Amino acid sequence: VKRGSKVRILRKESYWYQDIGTVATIDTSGIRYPVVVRFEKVSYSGVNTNNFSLDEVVEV
Amino acid sequence: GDFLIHHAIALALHTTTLILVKGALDARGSKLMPDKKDFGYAFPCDGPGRGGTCDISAWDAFYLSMFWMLNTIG
Amino acid sequence: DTTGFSGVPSQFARPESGVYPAEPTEQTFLGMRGPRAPGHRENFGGKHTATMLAIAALLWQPVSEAGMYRMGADGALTKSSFSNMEVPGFGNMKKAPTIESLFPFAKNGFDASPALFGKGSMIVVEDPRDGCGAYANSGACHTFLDEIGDALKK
Amino acid sequence: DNAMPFLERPPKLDGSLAGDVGFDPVGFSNYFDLRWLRESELKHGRVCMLGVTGLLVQEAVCLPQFSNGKTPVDDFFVVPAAGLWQVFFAIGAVEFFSHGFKLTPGDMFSEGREAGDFGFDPLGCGKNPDALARRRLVEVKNGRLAMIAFGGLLHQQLLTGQGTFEQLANFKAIA
Amino acid sequence: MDSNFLKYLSTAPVLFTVWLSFTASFIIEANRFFPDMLYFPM
Amino acid sequence: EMSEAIPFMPKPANIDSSMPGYAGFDPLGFTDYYSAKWMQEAEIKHGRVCMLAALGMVFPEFAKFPQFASFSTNPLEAFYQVSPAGWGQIFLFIGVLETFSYEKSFYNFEGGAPGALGFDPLRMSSNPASAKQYAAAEVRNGRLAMIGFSGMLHHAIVSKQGPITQIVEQNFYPK
Amino acid sequence: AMSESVPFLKKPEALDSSMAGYAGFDPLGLSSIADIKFLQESEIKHCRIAMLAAAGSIAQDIFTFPGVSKVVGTAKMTGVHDVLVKQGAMGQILLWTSFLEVFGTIALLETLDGKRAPGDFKFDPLGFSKNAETAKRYQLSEIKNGRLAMLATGGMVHGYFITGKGPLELLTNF
Amino acid sequence: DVAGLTPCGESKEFARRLDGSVKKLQTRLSKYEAGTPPALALQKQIDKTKNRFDRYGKAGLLCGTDGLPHLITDGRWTHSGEFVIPGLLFLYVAGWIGWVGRSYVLFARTADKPTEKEIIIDVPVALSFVSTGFIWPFSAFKEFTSGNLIVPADEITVSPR
Amino acid sequence: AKSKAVPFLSQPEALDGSMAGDVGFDPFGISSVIDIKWLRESELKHGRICMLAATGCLVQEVVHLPGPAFSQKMALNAWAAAPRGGMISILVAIGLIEMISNRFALTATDMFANPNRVPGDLGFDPLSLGANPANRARFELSEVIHGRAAMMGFSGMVHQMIVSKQAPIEQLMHFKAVDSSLMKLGGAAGNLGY
Ligand code: CLA
Ligand SMILES: CCCCCCCCCCCCCCCC(=O)OC[C@H](COP(=O)(O)OC[C@@H](O)CO)OC(=O)CCCCCCCCCCCCCCC
Ligand code: KC2
Ligand SMILES: CC1=C(C#C/C(C)=C/C=C/C(C)=C/C=C/C=C(C)/C=C/C=C(\C)C#CC2=C(C)C[C@@H](O)CC2(C)C)C(C)(C)C[C@H](O)C1
Ligand SMILES: CC1=C(C#C/C(C)=C/C=C/C(C)=C/C=C/C=C(C)/C=C/C=C(\C)C#CC2=C(C)C[C@@H](O)CC2(C)C)C(C)(C)C[C@H](O)C1
Ligand SMILES: CC1=C(C#C/C(C)=C/C=C/C(C)=C/C=C/C=C(C)/C=C/C=C(\C)C#CC2=C(C)C[C@@H](O)CC2(C)C)C(C)(C)C[C@H](O)C1
Numbered sequence A: 001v002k003r004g005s006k007v008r009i010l011r012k013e014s015y016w017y018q019d020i021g022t023v024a025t026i027d028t029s030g031i032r033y034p035v036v037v038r039f040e041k042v043s044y045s046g047v048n049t050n051n052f053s054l055d056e057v058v059e060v
Numbered sequence B: 001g002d003f004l005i006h007h008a009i010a011l012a013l014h015t016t017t018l019i020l021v022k023g024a025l026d027a028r029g030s031k032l033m034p035d036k037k038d039f040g041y042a043f044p045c046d047g048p049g050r051g052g053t054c055d056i057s058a059w060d061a062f063y064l065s066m067f068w069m070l071n072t073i074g
Numbered sequence C: 001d002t003t004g005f006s007g008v009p010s011q012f013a014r015p016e017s018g019v020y021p022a023e024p025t026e027q028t029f030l031g032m033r034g035p036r037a038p039g040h041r042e043n044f045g046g047k048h049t050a051t052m053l054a055i056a057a058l059l060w061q062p063v064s065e066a067g068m069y070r071m072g073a074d075g076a077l078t079k080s081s082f083s084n085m086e087v088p089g090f091g092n093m094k095k096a097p098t099i100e101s102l103f104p105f106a107k108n109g110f111d112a113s114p115a116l117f118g119k120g121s122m123i124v125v126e127d128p129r130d131g132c133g134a135y136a137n138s139g140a141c142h143t144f145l146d147e148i149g150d151a152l153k154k
Numbered sequence D: 001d002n003a004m005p006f007l008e009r010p011p012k013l014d015g016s017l018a019g020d021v022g023f024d025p026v027g028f029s030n031y032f033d034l035r036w037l038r039e040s041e042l043k044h045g046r047v048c049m050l051g052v053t054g055l056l057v058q059e060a061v062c063l064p065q066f067s068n069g070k071t072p073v074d075d076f077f078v079v080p081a082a083g084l085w086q087v088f089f090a091i092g093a094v095e096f097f098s099h100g101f102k103l104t105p106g107d108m109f110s111e112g113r114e115a116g117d118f119g120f121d122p123l124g125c126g127k128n129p130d131a132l133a134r135r136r137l138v139e140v141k142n143g144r145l146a147m148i149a150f151g152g153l154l155h156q157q158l159l160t161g162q163g164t165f166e167q168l169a170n171f172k173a174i175a
Numbered sequence E: 001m002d003s004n005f006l007k008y009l010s011t012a013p014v015l016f017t018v019w020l021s022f023t024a025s026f027i028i029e030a031n032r033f034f035p036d037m038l039y040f041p042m
Numbered sequence F: 001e002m003s004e005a006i007p008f009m010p011k012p013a014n015i016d017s018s019m020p021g022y023a024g025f026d027p028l029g030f031t032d033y034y035s036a037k038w039m040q041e042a043e044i045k046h047g048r049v050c051m052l053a054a055l056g057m058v059f060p061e062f063a064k065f066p067q068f069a070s071f072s073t074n075p076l077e078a079f080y081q082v083s084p085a086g087w088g089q090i091f092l093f094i095g096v097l098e099t100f101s102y103e104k105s106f107y108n109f110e111g112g113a114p115g116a117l118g119f120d121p122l123r124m125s126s127n128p129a130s131a132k133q134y135a136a137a138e139v140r141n142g143r144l145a146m147i148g149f150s151g152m153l154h155h156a157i158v159s160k161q162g163p164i165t166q167i168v169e170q171n172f173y174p175k
Numbered sequence G: 001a002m003s004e005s006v007p008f009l010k011k012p013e014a015l016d017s018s019m020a021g022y023a024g025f026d027p028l029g030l031s032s033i034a035d036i037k038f039l040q041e042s043e044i045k046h047c048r049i050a051m052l053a054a055a056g057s058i059a060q061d062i063f064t065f066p067g068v069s070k071v072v073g074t075a076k077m078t079g080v081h082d083v084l085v086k087q088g089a090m091g092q093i094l095l096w097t098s099f100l101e102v103f104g105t106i107a108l109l110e111t112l113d114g115k116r117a118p119g120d121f122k123f124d125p126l127g128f129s130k131n132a133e134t135a136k137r138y139q140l141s142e143i144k145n146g147r148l149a150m151l152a153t154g155g156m157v158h159g160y161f162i163t164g165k166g167p168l169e170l171l172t173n174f
Numbered sequence H: 001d002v003a004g005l006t007p008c009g010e011s012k013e014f015a016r017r018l019d020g021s022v023k024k025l026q027t028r029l030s031k032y033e034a035g036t037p038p039a040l041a042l043q044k045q046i047d048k049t050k051n052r053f054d055r056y057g058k059a060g061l062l063c064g065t066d067g068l069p070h071l072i073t074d075g076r077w078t079h080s081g082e083f084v085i086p087g088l089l090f091l092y093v094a095g096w097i098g099w100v101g102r103s104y105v106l107f108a109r110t111a112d113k114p115t116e117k118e119i120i121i122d123v124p125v126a127l128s129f130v131s132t133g134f135i136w137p138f139s140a141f142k143e144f145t146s147g148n149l150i151v152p153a154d155e156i157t158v159s160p161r
Numbered sequence I: 001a002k003s004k005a006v007p008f009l010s011q012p013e014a015l016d017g018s019m020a021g022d023v024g025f026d027p028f029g030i031s032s033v034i035d036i037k038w039l040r041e042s043e044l045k046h047g048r049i050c051m052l053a054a055t056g057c058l059v060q061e062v063v064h065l066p067g068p069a070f071s072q073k074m075a076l077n078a079w080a081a082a083p084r085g086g087m088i089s090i091l092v093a094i095g096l097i098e099m100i101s102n103r104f105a106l107t108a109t110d111m112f113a114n115p116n117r118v119p120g121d122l123g124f125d126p127l128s129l130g131a132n133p134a135n136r137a138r139f140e141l142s143e144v145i146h147g148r149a150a151m152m153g154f155s156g157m158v159h160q161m162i163v164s165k166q167a168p169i170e171q172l173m174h175f176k177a178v179d180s181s182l183m184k185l186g187g188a189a190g191n192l193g194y
C-alpha cells in the first residue's frame, strides 16, 4: 500500500477486522508490522490506531 | 390468560436460548476477547482492561442463563 | 453545512441518481411541463389531448343516453337497460355485460345527459342571501352590518 | 382537393390510396400504419356491404331451417347458438388462412402484402389496370357508404322494430 | 436568540425530554378527546 | 438514458429493449438487485398462470364441465367444492409441468430465453416479426391478466359471485 | 402609443389593426394572459353562436315550424329548453354541434400553430369574398354585428327572465 | 360466534359488568350533593363508563364468559380493526422512526466531527429527516434494492470465529 | 438593512427581495433555519389548497352537486355527508398527484435535487397562461398574495363554522353574535378536569 490510502483490515483478531482505516506511515526496515493504520472507531482499550503487516491489509 | 402466559414462556425460552446460544457461539472468541478459546470454558474474566470483562466466559453465560431457566420453569 | 430542508441529497448524505433531467418549457393541455421523450410533445401534446378530450366528449353523448329505445305501437319509445338484451350463444350467460356496466349511471341514480347532469339530478343553485338586503333589515334577517348598526345604536 | 380546407393536409395521406380526399382530422396515420388503417377500412366496408345486403334480404327471405326474427337484427337471436359459433369460427378460419396466420399490425404486412388485397378475382373482373383503379375507388366509396348505411339500418330496426322496407312503407315518427 | 443557548437546546437530553414530552402530550390529548380506543373502529 | 415509462426517472440499468414487454418501468429497482432474467421468467410465469386464471374465473359463467355442472359459479366457492382428490391431481399435473421449469431455471438458467420451456407445438414464432409480436403480446396479456385476476378475485371476495354475474346484477359496490 | 378606445389607457401590446374588429379595446389586459389567437377564435365562436341565437329569438317570436306548438307549451326562449330536452330536439342539436366542435377543437389547435386564421373555416359556397376589399369589410361587419348580437342575446334572455315576453312581444307590449 | 365467543352487545356478562361499574360510581355519587364539584366529577365518570360500554357493544367485539372483550387476531377481516389495522398503523410509524434515525446517522457520519451530531443534534437537518419518513416503505425499498441499505458481509467487523 | 414589513427587526437573510411577496417578513427566523426553497414550496402549496378551500366553502354554499349526499350548505357538514368512497378517492388522487407532480422527489432531502426545479413550479400551466414573460412577476406576486389571503380567510371561515354552526355566506346574512354562554376557550385544567 502507500501512505494516506484507505485500507481494509484482514487480521481476524483485530477490533477493526474488515473495517476501513487509513495508513499513516510504512517503515522500510525489517519490521514485522510496518503498516501503521489509524481508525475513526476506537477499540475497547480506547486505542484508535495499530500496526499491521502488508498481507493483513488491502487497498480499497 | 393462556395466550399471555404462553407468550411469556416464548420470551423466556427465547431469552434463555439467547444467553446460551451467545455463550456457545462466542465461546471460542469475541471482539472483546478474540483468544477466549485459549483460556478455556470457565475462567473469571480477562481483567478490568478493555472496559471490563466480568462474566465474559462461556461458563458465565451458562451461569446467567441458569437464572433464566429458573424463571421460565417458574 | 446543511441548510435544513434544502432538498439537495448530497447535503443530507442521501443517495442521489445524479442524472438530473433538463426541463423542457413545452406544456400539454391536460399534462404537466416536464422531461419527455423525443417526439413525445409533437405526437401526444396539446393537439392530441384536446382532440381526444373532444372525441371523448362527443362519444359520451351516446354513452350518457345508453339504453334500448324501443318504439311501441304509438310513437312513444321506452328506454330499457341493455341488460335486457339477452345473448344467444354464451350458455348460462344469458344477460351480457354491456356499455352500462362500464358507465352505471342508473345504478347510482345519476341519470346522465349528453351535456352531463340532467333533468333528473341537475346542479342545485340556491340563494344564500335568502331575499333580504345587506343592511336595514327586519327581524327575519340580521346581517353582520345590522349587528354593527345594533352595536352602534344601543 | 382537401375535404376540410381550413385544416392543413395530413402528411401521410399523399393521395396514393383510393378515396384520399385528405379527410383525416383526428390525426390517424400519424400514429398508426396507413396499411393497417386501409386494411381495416376495406374489411369494415366489405363486411358492411355484405351486412346491408344481409339486413335487406333477411327481412324478405327466411330459410326453412331457421325461424324469422320480428326485425332482421332479431334473426341473429332466433338462429341456433351452435350455428352462430360455426359461422364465427368459419370466418375465423378464413381470416387465419387469408392473412397467412399473421393477424396483427406487427406481422400482417411483414410479408409485403398490399392493404385490403387478398388476390380474390375469380371471374377476372379486375384484370385491367385502369378499370382496377376506378373500381378500387368504387369499393372504398361504397364500403364507406355501406358502413354508414349499416349503422342506420341496424339502429333504425332496433328503434322502430319493423325492418327497413317496412319502415319505408309504413313510416312512424318518434313521439 | 443566542446561538449557544440554541446549541444547548439541541443537546441530546433536552431534545429527548422535549420530544418525549411532546410525544406523551399528544398521546394524552388523543386519549382525552378520544378515550377507550381498544380497536381501530371499523 | 431516461425511463420511457417514467420520463423524469433515469433508465433502470439492468432492463433493456431486448426483453419482450420492456417499458423502462422499474421505479423501485428490483433488477439492479435481483437477476433480471429471473424476474423476467418469474413475470412470464405469473402472467401465464394468471391468463389461465382469468379465463378460468370467467369461463364457468358460460358453461361447466358435466361432472362439476352442479358446482357454483362463484369461483371462491367452486374452489372448496372440488374434491381433494381433484386438487391433488391438479397439483400433480402443475408439478409435472414445473419439473421442466425446475430444469430451465435451477440448472439451465442461461441457455435460451426467459419462459422458453420448448412449448411451441403449432410451430409458431418461425416468422421473426410474428415471433417478436407474440413475445410482446404474451408479456402484456400476462400482466393484464394479473391485474384482471387480482380485480376479479377481490370482486368475488366483496360480492360473493363471479365477475360477470356481479356486472349483470350491477353489484359493483360493497353492501 | 395610447388606446383609441380608452384614451387614458395604453395600447394593449398584443392587438394590431390587421385584426378584425380591432378598436384597441383590451383595458383589463386579458390578451396578455391568454393567447390572442384563442381569444380571437373564442370571440368569433361566441359571436356566431349568439348571432344565431339573436336571429332565433326574433324568428321564434315571428313564426314557428309546423307541429312544434304541441310539444312545447306556451314556453319561449329558455323555457323551451327543458321540454325540448325531453324530446330529442336538443339532444340532436347537441350531438351534431358537438360533432362539428370536435373538428373545431382540431381547427383551434391549427390556429394556435398559426396554420390558419381564427374563424377561417373556408366556408364560401355562394360568392361574396371574391374581392379583397369586400372580404376585409365583411370580416369587420361580422365581428361588430356578432359583438352586438351577444349583448342582444343577453338582453333578450334577461328580458325573458324578467317578463317572459320574448323580443317581439316585449316590443308590442311595454 | 368466533371461537365460541359471544358478541358483546348481547352477552349478559358484559351488561352486568356495565351495571356493576355504574353502581360503584353511583354509590360514590350518593354521598354528595347535586351541584358540588365531586358530584359533578363523579357524574362525568359515570357518563364516560356508559359511553365506553355502549361503544364496545356496537363495535363488533366478541366477549368471553367473563364479559370482557376478546381480540381475534388470526387475520380475519371481520376483526382486522383489533390487530391487523392498528398493527399497520404501528409499522408505518415504527418504520418512519427507523428510516428517520437511519438517515440521520448516515448524515452524521459525513460530518466534520460525527459524534457531536449525535449528542448535539443538528435540529434543522434532523427535522428535514423527520419529514422524510412519510414515504419510508418506498424510500427504504428503493434504498434496499439500489444496494444502499445492506452492506456486504466483507464490510462488517466480526469475531475471529 | 432593516425589514420593511417589521421595521424594528433586522432584514432576514435568505430574503433578498427576489421572491414574490418578499416584503422582509420573517421575525421568527425560520428562513435562517429552513431553506427558503422548501418554505416557498410549502407556502405556495398551503395557499393554493386554501384558495380552493375558500372557494370551496363559498361555492358549496351557492351551488351543489345534485343528490341528497351533496346537499349540505354548511361546509363542515359536507365532510361527513359526502360519500366516503369518493372522499377517499379524492385523498388517493391527491396522493397520486403529489407523487407524479413532484416527480418522486417528494421529501425534504430530494425535492429540488434537480437544479432546474423551482419552488412552486410543478410544471402546471395547462392553458399556457404564463407564456408571456412580462406577467410572470405580477402573476407570481398575485398568486402568493391570493394564497396568503386565502390561508387567512379559510382559517376564519372554518373557525366561524365551528363557533356558529352556519355556512359563511348565510352566517353573514343571518348573523347572530357570540353569546359566550358556550364556546368558552380552554378550561380543561382550571376546573381540574371534567
Ligand atoms: C378509477 C376511476 C374511478 C371510478 C370507476 C369511480 C367510481 C365511482 N366514484 Mg369516484 N373518483 C375517482 C375515480 C373513480 N371513481 C377519482 C380519481 C376521484 C377524485 C377526483 C373521484 C372522486 C369521487 C367523488 C367525490 C365521488 C365519487 C363517486 C363515485 C361513484 C358513483 C359514480 C357516479 O355516479 O358517477 C356518475 C356521476 C358522474 C359522472 C358525475 C361527475 C360529476 C362532475 C363531473 C364532477 C366535477 C369534477 C370536478 C371539476 C373535479 C375536478 C378535479 C379533477 C380533475 C382532479 C363510483 C363508485 C361518488 C360516490 O361515491 O357516490 C356514491 C362521489 O361522491 N368519486
Ligand atoms: C401562525 C398560526 C397562528 C396560530 C394562532 C393561534 C390562535 C389561537 C390560539 C389561542 C387563542 C386564545 C387562547 C385563549 C384560550 C386559553 O388561553 O384557554 C386557557 C387554557 C387553560 O385553561 P385555564 O387554566 O385557563 O382554565 C381557566 C378557567 O377560567 C376555566 O376553567 O389555556 C390552554 O392551555 C389552552 C391552549 C392549549 C395549549 C396547548 C396548545 C397545543 C400546543 C401545540 C404546540 C404549541 C402551539 C402554540 C401554543 C401556544
Ligand atoms: C388510441 C389510444 C389513446 C386514446 C383513446 C387516448 C385518449 C386520450 C384522452 C381521452 C379522453 C386524453 C385527455 C388524452 C390525453 C393525453 N394522452 Mg392520449 N389517448 C391515447 C394514446 C396515447 C399515447 C400512446 C400517449 C398519450 C399521451 C397523453 C398525454 C400526456 C402527455 C404529456 O403529459 O406530456 C395526455 C394529456 C402520452 C403520455 O404521456 O401519456 C401519459 C402518450 O405517449 N395517449 N389521451
Ligand atoms: C404457446 C403455443 C400455443 C398456445 C396456447 C394457449 C392455450 C394460449 C392461452 C392464452 C390465454 C388463455 C390467454 C388469456 C388471457 C386473459 C386475459 C388477458 C384476461 C384478462 C382479464 C381482464 C383484463 C379483466 C377483467 C374484469 C375486471 C377486473 C372487472 C370485472 O367486473 C369485469 C372484467 C372481466 C372486465 C399453441 C397451442 C396455439 C401452439 C403454438 O405453437 C404455441
Ligand atoms: C395536490 C396538491 C393541491 C390540492 C388539493 C385538494 C384538496 C384538492 C381537492 C380536490 C377535490 C375536492 C376533487 C373533487 C372531485 C369530485 C368529483 C369528481 C365528484 C364526482 C361526483 C360523482 C362521481 C357523482 C354523483 C351522483 C351520485 C353517486 C348519486 C346522486 O344522488 C348524487 C350525484 C348525482 C352527484 C394543490 C392542487 C392545491 C397544489 C399542489 O399541486 C398539491
Ligand atoms: C394556474 C393555471 C390555471 C388555474 C387555475 C385556478 C384553479 C385558479 C383559481 C384561483 C382561486 C380559486 C383563487 C381564490 C382565491 C380566494 C381568496 C383569495 C379568498 C380569500 C377569503 C378571504 C380573505 C375571506 C373571508 C371571509 C371571513 C373569514 C368572514 C366570512 O363570514 C365571510 C368572508 C368570505 C368575507 C388554469 C387551470 C386556468 C390554466 C393555466 O394555464 C394555469
Ligand SMILES: CCCCCCCCCCCCO[C@@H]1O[C@H](CO)[C@@H](O[C@H]2O[C@H](CO)[C@@H](O)[C@H](O)[C@H]2O)[C@H](O)[C@H]1O
Pocket: C108, F172, F173, F174, F175, I083, I084, I085, I086
Ligand atoms: C373501473 C375501475 C378501475 C379501477 C377500479 C379499482 C377500484 C379500487 C378499489 C375500489 C374500492 C371500491 O370502494 C367501495 O366502492 C364504493 C365507492 O363509492 C362504496 O360503496 C358505497 O357507494 C355505493 C355507490 O352508491 C353504494 O351502492 C354502496 O352501497 C356503498 O357502500 C364503498 O363504500 C367503497 O368501499
